[PDB]
Amino acid sequence: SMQEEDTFRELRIFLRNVTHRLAIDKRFRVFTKPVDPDEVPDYVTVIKQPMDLSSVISKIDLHKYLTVKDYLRDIDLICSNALEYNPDRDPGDRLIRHRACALRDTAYAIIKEELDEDFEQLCEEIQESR
Numbered sequence: 001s002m003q004e005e006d007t008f009r010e011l012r013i014f015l016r017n018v019t020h021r022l023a024i025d026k027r028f029r030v031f032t033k034p035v036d037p038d039e040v041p042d043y044v045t046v047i048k049q050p051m052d053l054s055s056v057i058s059k060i061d062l063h064k065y066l067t068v069k070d071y072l073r074d075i076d077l078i079c080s081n082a083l084e085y086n087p088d089r090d091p092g093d094r095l096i097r098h099r100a101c102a103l104r105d106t107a108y109a110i111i112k113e114e115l116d117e118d119f120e121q122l123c124e125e126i127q128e129s130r
């Protein structure tokens with residue numbers, strides 16, 4: 001229905017705003033674009049589902065997220081990819097892991113403060129009816 005279309009449109013607006021706020025944070029610059037395959041050849045071989053904030057925006061615009069739960073799975077993926085690809089004790093790896101965990105924590109904190117639980121519940125119930 002048009003009411004359900006309106007619900008998912010509001011979801012997309014909300015998700016774009018959250019994503020923009022993460023993307024403009026200097027700490028998360030490393031997560032704003034895909035890892036360049038020409039610069040890092042072995043990334044695509046190790047990480048099976050690459051994810052980054054530009055790709056998240058693309059997926060929002062393609063109507064791929066029908067719930068905030070599904071969005072957070074892709075935020076979790078950005079984080080888990082970083083931990084998987086950069087597991088070593090050296091400062092470079094530890095920095096990206098800290099930033100990845102901060103990205104995840106920040107996204108969850110924004111959603112905790114600004115997502116109405118009844119809005120998410122509605123989204124989930126529309127999704128299940130599809």
Ligand SMILES: CNC(=O)[C@H](CCCCNC(C)=O)NC(C)=O
Nearest residue numbers: 030035039040081082085086096
């Ligand atoms: C020129 N690039 C490199 O040397 C790469 C850099 C990888 C950047 C890691 N980014 C993320 C998002 O996990 N490092 C190696 C070990 O392949």
